[PDB]
Amino acid sequence: VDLEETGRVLSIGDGIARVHGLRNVQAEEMVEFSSGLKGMSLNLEPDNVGVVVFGNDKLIKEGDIVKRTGAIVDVPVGEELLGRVVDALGNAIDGKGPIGSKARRRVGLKAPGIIPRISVREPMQTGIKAVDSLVPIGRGQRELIIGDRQTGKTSIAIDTIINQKRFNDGTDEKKKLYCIYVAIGQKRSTVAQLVKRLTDADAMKYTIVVSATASDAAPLQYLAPYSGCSMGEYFRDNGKHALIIYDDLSKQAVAYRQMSLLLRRPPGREAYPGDVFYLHSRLLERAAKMNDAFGGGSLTALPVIETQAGDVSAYIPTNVISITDGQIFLETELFYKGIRPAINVGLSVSRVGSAAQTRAMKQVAGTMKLELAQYREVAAFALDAATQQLLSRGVRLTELLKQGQYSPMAIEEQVAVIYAGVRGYLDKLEPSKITKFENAFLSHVISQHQALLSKIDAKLKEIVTNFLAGFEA
Amino acid sequence: DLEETGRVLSIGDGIARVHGLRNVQAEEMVEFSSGLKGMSLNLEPDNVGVVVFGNDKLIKEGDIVKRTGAIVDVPVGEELLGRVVDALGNAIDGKGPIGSKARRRVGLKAPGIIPRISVREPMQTGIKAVDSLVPIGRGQRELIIGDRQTGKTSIAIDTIINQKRFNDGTDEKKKLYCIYVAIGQKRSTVAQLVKRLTDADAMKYTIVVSATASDAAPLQYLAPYSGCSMGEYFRDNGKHALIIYDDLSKQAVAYRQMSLLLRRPPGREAYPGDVFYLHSRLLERAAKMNDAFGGGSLTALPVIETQAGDVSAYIPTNVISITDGQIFLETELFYKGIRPAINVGLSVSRVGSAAQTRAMKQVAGTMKLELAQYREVAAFAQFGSDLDAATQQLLSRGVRLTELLKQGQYSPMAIEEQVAVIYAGVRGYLDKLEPSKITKFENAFLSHVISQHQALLSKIRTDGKISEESDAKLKEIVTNFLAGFEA
Amino acid sequence: TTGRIVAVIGAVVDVQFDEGLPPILNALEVQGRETRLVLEVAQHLGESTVRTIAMDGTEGLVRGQKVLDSGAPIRIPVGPETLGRIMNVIGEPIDERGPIKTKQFAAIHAEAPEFVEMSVEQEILVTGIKVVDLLAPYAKGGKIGLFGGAGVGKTVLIMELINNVAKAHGGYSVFAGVGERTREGNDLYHEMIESGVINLKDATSKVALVYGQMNEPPGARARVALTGLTVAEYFRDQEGQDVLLFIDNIFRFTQAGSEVSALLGRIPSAVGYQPTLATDMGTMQERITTTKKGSITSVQAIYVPADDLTDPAPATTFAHLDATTVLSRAIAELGIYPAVDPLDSTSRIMDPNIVGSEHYDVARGVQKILQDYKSLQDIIAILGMDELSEEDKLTVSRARKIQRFLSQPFQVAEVFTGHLGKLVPLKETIKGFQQILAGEYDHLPEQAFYMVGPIEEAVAKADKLAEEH
Amino acid sequence: VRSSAGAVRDAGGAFGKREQAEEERYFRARAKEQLAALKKHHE
Numbered sequence A: 001v002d003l004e005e006t007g008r009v010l011s012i013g014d015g016i017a018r019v020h021g022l023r024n025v026q027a028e029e030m031v032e033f034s035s036g037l038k039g040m041s042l043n044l045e046p047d048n049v050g051v052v053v054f055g056n057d058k059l060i061k062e063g064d065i066v067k068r069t070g071a072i073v074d075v076p077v078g079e080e081l082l083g084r085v086v087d088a089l090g091n092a093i094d095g096k097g098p099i100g101s102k103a104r105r106r107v108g109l110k111a112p113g114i115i116p117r118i119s120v121r122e123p124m125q126t127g128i129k130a131v132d133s134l135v136p137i138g139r140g141q142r143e144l145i146i147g148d149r150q151t152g153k154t155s156i157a158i159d160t161i162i163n164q165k166r167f168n169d170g171t172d173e174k175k176k177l178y179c180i181y182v183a184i185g186q187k188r189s190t191v192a193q194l195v196k197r198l199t200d201a202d203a204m205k206y207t208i209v210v211s212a213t214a215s216d217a218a219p220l221q222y223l224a225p226y227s228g229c230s231m232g233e234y235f236r237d238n239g240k241h242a243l244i245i246y247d248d249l250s251k252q253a254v255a256y257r258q259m260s261l262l263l264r265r266p267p268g269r270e271a272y273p274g275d276v277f278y279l280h281s282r283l284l285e286r287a288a289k290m291n292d293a294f295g296g297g298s299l300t301a302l303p304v305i306e307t308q309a310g311d312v313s314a315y316i317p318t319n320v321i322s323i324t325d326g327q328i329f330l331e332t333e334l335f336y337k338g339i340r341p342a343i344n345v346g347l348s349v350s351r352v353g354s355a356a357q358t359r360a361m362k363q364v365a366g367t368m369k370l371e372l373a374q375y376r377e378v379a380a381f382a383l384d385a386a387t388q389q390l391l392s393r394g395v396r397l398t399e400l401l402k403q404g405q406y407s408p409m410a411i412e413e414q415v416a417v418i419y420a421g422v423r424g425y426l427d428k429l430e431p432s433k434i435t436k437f438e439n440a441f442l443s444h445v446i447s448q449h450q451a452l453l454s455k456i457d458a459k460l461k462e463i464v465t466n467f468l469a470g471f472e473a
Numbered sequence B: 001d002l003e004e005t006g007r008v009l010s011i012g013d014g015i016a017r018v019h020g021l022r023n024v025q026a027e028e029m030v031e032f033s034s035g036l037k038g039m040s041l042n043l044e045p046d047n048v049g050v051v052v053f054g055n056d057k058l059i060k061e062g063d064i065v066k067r068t069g070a071i072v073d074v075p076v077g078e079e080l081l082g083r084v085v086d087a088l089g090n091a092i093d094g095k096g097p098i099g100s101k102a103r104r105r106v107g108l109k110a111p112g113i114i115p116r117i118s119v120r121e122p123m124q125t126g127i128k129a130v131d132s133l134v135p136i137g138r139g140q141r142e143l144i145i146g147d148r149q150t151g152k153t154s155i156a157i158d159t160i161i162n163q164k165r166f167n168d169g170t171d172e173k174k175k176l177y178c179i180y181v182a183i184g185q186k187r188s189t190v191a192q193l194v195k196r197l198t199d200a201d202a203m204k205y206t207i208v209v210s211a212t213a214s215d216a217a218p219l220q221y222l223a224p225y226s227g228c229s230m231g232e233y234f235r236d237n238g239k240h241a242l243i244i245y246d247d248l249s250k251q252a253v254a255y256r257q258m259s260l261l262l263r264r265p266p267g268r269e270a271y272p273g274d275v276f277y278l279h280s281r282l283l284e285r286a287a288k289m290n291d292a293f294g295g296g297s298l299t300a301l302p303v304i305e306t307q308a309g310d311v312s313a314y315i316p317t318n319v320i321s322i323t324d325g326q327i328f329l330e331t332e333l334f335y336k337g338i339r340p341a342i343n344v345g346l347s348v349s350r351v352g353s354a355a356q357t358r359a360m361k362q363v364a365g366t367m368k369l370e371l372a373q374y375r376e377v378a379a380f381a382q383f384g385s386d387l388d389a390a391t392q393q394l395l396s397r398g399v400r401l402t403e404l405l406k407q408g409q410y411s412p413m414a415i416e417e418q419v420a421v422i423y424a425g426v427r428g429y430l431d432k433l434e435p436s437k438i439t440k441f442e443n444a445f446l447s448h449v450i451s452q453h454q455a456l457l458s459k460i461r462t463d464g465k466i467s468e469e470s471d472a473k474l475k476e477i478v479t480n481f482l483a484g485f486e487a
Numbered sequence C: 001t002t003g004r005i006v007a008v009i010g011a012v013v014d015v016q017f018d019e020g021l022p023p024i025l026n027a028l029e030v031q032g033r034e035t036r037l038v039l040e041v042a043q044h045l046g047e048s049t050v051r052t053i054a055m056d057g058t059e060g061l062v063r064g065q066k067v068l069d070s071g072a073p074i075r076i077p078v079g080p081e082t083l084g085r086i087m088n089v090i091g092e093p094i095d096e097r098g099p100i101k102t103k104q105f106a107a108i109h110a111e112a113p114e115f116v117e118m119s120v121e122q123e124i125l126v127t128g129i130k131v132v133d134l135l136a137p138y139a140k141g142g143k144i145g146l147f148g149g150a151g152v153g154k155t156v157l158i159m160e161l162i163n164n165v166a167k168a169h170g171g172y173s174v175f176a177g178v179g180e181r182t183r184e185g186n187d188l189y190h191e192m193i194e195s196g197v198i199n200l201k202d203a204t205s206k207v208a209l210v211y212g213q214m215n216e217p218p219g220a221r222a223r224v225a226l227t228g229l230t231v232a233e234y235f236r237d238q239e240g241q242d243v244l245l246f247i248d249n250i251f252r253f254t255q256a257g258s259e260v261s262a263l264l265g266r267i268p269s270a271v272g273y274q275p276t277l278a279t280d281m282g283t284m285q286e287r288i289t290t291t292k293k294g295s296i297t298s299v300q301a302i303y304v305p306a307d308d309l310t311d312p313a314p315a316t317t318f319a320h321l322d323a324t325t326v327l328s329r330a331i332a333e334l335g336i337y338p339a340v341d342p343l344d345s346t347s348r349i350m351d352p353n354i355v356g357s358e359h360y361d362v363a364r365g366v367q368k369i370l371q372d373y374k375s376l377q378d379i380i381a382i383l384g385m386d387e388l389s390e391e392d393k394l395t396v397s398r399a400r401k402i403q404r405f406l407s408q409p410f411q412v413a414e415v416f417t418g419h420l421g422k423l424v425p426l427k428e429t430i431k432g433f434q435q436i437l438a439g440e441y442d443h444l445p446e447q448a449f450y451m452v453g454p455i456e457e458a459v460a461k462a463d464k465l466a467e468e469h
Numbered sequence D: 001v002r003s004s005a006g007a008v009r010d011a012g013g014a015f016g017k018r019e020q021a022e023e024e025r026y027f028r029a030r031a032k033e034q035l036a037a038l039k040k041h042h043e
């Protein structure tokens, strides 16, 4: 054996090979086992290399040959990944043949510094009324989606991806948004339902799905967010815009904890590695808005964090809250009360918004924000004497922020419905009907009043009340 | 000579592992090649673990280390009075060397059962709430406890300032030398503290021992024991000293750092098991000596910082269990206008009455009762109309006595002055007066009695009690003053 | 002299030297790197091997790779040439404007000024922020801390202070970005160029910028505060003008040290922190100070993890400050900005012998009413408002007007609301609260006192609202 | 025994949220009365 370029396994157990030799190996280099497996050299020690195995480590035996590749771990990037489902190392797992990418990128590359960046300027439209009006997201931002299991977190992410079609089918190049969904720790059938949802919506054509599922080795789940990020950075740096979803970062931290403990790096708070903050901070800092000298491109991140029994004060949740530009808080109570999407508007925050979220949206959501804040102050009354004029508008508006799944809305469609509530045209309608009203009203406006949804408040003001009156029969 | 010297095997985080020093004792001072001092805390079969009393960054693998032959000690005596020193007793005030005749081991055993006698001499703070309701005697250990910024240090400083009255006089039995140990504080804070004591001319009877936040952990661990040994010089030589440990929370953190880095087994809140023992050996050295052993005393005022008022935390638990009582301070009381912010309900002195003059014992006894009665009805004042005149009497007395417990900073009172204003309250000369006017009355009434009734104030002082003639005299003075009060 | 890498584990690198061993704190330069990689010596392990912490990523490092001992701790450019520039932990320019051509360099490690060098001078520094100036005023050359959980407004507050204080400042300012968002570094840089505070066309810039943000490995984050304070130290000692030092966020210095503590071989202390948390903070904090040589006014933003003020990091920070501005989520959620807790923010100069009896009496009267208000809210929770006595309703009415008059539109927040920033002189602040407490505005609705400057704007706001009614 | 003023608001509990709404209700009714009185003082 050439001990500079190759080594032999000393011991192998639970995804970690200790390897003799590999004297010339770099930290974070990819190695290759004689059995076909790949690995990463994480622990360089005087008498051994701690290699973390990217696959079924149970195929490796004491004595097996391990070889340098000479390369720091990297992944394929490029538009060839669009419409494809891949693993954390960029391999096709959709059965549609090889990725024909002519470019690769290291997974752990530094985030852009102060200079290459510019103030966030363009809207990232989710097509979800509660978000686009009250928690608006800009391109280059990092907005956390956080809540307990089954509060609707993934659903926000998927609606957002689906909403981009209206832009990606358009002729305006600057409004286009390429999507990356990173699935970490999920079961394969859930990811399959996901790509099916995306395919039915014609959303896979502009989406890369990176999947490191529950039976994929811990290193692959650790790596997945960084691989997906590199693929987004190719858009960021080549004058285009990408959105990345990390679903979810709770499961990535768990995998990082396993790997690190088995490398014999001492357990920190909650047995997590000492640098779990850094694991997430370095990732999310890679989402950025680039200046024109660097191409004007952008990458926006929607990380997802699972809380336990509503505990946002928990270790990993607090880390990521402190990193992100804003957060969308989802709650079980709200979900079951009928508030779906289950967003806590009071707690949910987004950073200002470019002036540009829209302009006609800025009008109507401006008054709704004021009207709901005043409402929230009295909401808790839920007998009542005159506290009911204090409740009226707010209760109607709360019903108007409810939204079904897989039907993300155009900004003008959102404005038209918010308007009806905000101009007090539902103040005497039974709050339980508003759900029925909105769907029926919106369907009728889409079908017969497409001209009204145009240029998106003198003629428009008079024409909306014309429909709303006759409709509210 | 590997018996008297050794060499550094490794050094990091202020722990030097040393090969050799075969003849070194546990807790011996050693010296490094640069000039830095260390202490041998772990004697192991193949190494000594040495904690560094200074900048451990200056030590390198291979450095020579030598024995001093002596268990860690410090200078002691009257030459330290007026001086600010570090944990080793070196001057840091720029006023030159400490002209010290004597040294004392920092870790000397406390006096045992026999040499002591029960606490029976007043240690007067000059603070009305304390001297009447949480009285402290000479030889006592009384904890000052509460969250950040409730007035803890201010209690200690006003106490120190109060002793001037005695220290200026001719009665050597009432004199009290003071030691203030700052632990983990920033240097600019200590400088302000020293400025205050100097301005009050209290530095002349005070020693300041300071181991500040940028001082190595072993120095912060050491500082209370060093200050303690300074006080014991006075205790053993028939004199009386007061020592403030500000604060013991910071001393335990420093000790925990050393212990963890020595890889001693960690316990609750990562404190080592001997953290109780750290504080118990320190505070049991405060004592009241009987006449056969000189008559002297050392009184301790350790300070503990609580977090969110949790007295069940590990270190506050330990210290509460060691001391003879606590003065508890609270942020809510502070902002309500109760300053000093003493929660009387939660405060205790287990020596109690024995540490009070008869004059105080008189008036305080009744005030304690009436506040305890009032505290049970206090909620009914803020909302309660159709309530019987009996509970109305308790509320009127209570709100008025409560105002008498308020006190501004830096103005400690002579015992006779305290008892004159307390007498006014407990005899019912405030009962018809507006609560907002009680402090105005107190100030005015005190100015009046000081200006023109020194003879009455003097006798009450000298005799230490209120005679029947004194009570009849004071009865008339308050009556006549009150009659022409609001001009 | 040359060493060889023998181990790499994350940010922790062991290096063996055949002859001369580099002292602890020494900066070591890794050979064969595209960009400069510094290892700082942290420990002597024995057998001629030191353990170090890296100042940048360790990817690509090989066992046997050569390391040169620089002979000194990290040394950075100091002096007028840092003004208008943005530098690294290790003093490299990161504004793409070229080399920093200084004559003078300084070690980022240094001894704290001695007890004899302490200054006892205490003079109010007026900010124009009502809550601060009234209840916990800052002192010139003082140490100021801004505590707060996530998103409560530390950064907004610190930028308003740079707008109010630093833009009226006759000397030099230093800003250290420590473990925060790179995008905020971009914001700050371009904002200061827009306002002329940084001048790119001449030598007139009055601020030096140092950044080591959350994208950086923990070694860089643990040391950047030292880089920024080193720049400030030069100005304090070698020049005759007063210095301002702003740091966002100093928690991240403590967090960064916890990130490597286990790999440096320490048993963890409580809440997963390093056993050296307090002394590490002390040796750093004690350098950030006014001395007899010169004055530094320091403003430090301090993250309070999960809003828990008893967490060892912010808990240990309190002892290092002369004034504390404590921000509160409950107050921010009521819509009050700045979200300062009036009953948990303090100042060593809040003393009638320093600010005067009028200032002190109004401050303590405001706090008394707000404290009494807390007791009443418990009662209201059961009884309701209408059932309270007229005296209590009056305490509630006034306390609520006070709470809202403590809010204030910040110039730097003209982006969120569209409302113009306001600066309130001290004497105007005292007068307004005096008048509210005296009952002079019992006839106006509380909404008139929300988000205004001086008391006259409240009277005028009440007049606009009456017309719209 | 131990001081505890404001604990109900501090909990963000039902009772806490209710009291906040109850104060708001009261002071919005006051504002209506005060703005009208200010309108009639206007002339």
Ligand SMILES: Nc1ncnc2c1ncn2[C@@H]1O[C@H](COP(=O)(O)OP(=O)(O)OP(=O)(O)O)[C@@H](O)[C@H]1O
Binding pocket: A147, A148, A149, A150, A151, A152, A153, A154, A155, A156, A340, A341, A403, A404, A405
């Ligand atoms: N706007 C909505 N309206 C109605 N139902 C919804 C909405 N959003 C999500 N749901 C439903 O709630 C359930 C949970 O949603 P989702 O899978 O997005 O939650 P999650 O928080 O990602 O949960 P987990 O990751 O733990 O499975 C799904 O059945 C989904 O169909």
Ligand SMILES: Nc1ncnc2c1ncn2[C@@H]1O[C@H](COP(=O)(O)OP(=O)(O)OP(=O)(O)O)[C@@H](O)[C@H]1O
Binding pocket: B147, B148, B149, B150, B151, B152, B153, B154, B155, B339, B340, B341, B407, B408, B409, C347, C348, C350, C351
């Ligand atoms: N009796 C009093 N009357 C008025 N003000 C007081 C009184 N006692 C203390 N103060 C003020 O309270 C503030 C805090 O007091 P002090 O520093 O003694 O508290 P502490 O508990 O020691 O706080 P720290 O956490 O800073 O050590 C100081 O500004 C002090 O001047």
Ligand SMILES: Nc1ncnc2c1ncn2[C@@H]1O[C@H](COP(=O)(O)OP(=O)(O)O)[C@@H](O)[C@H]1O
Binding pocket: A351, A352, C148, C149, C150, C151, C152, C153, C154, C155, C156, C157, C337, C338, C410, C413, C416
């Ligand atoms: N003085 C203020 N005026 C208006 N809004 C504010 C103010 N301070 C904070 N905010 C709101 O809080 C958000 C976060 O404030 P920031 O200073 O970034 O928080 P952090 O405490 O995390 O630094 C801002 O984007 C803004 O929405």
Ligand SMILES: [Mg+2]
Binding pocket: A153, A154, A155
């Ligand atoms: Mg999900």
Ligand SMILES: [Mg+2]
Binding pocket: B152, B153, B154, B246
């Ligand atoms: Mg104190």
Ligand SMILES: [Mg+2]
Binding pocket: C154, C155, C156, C180
């Ligand atoms: Mg911030």
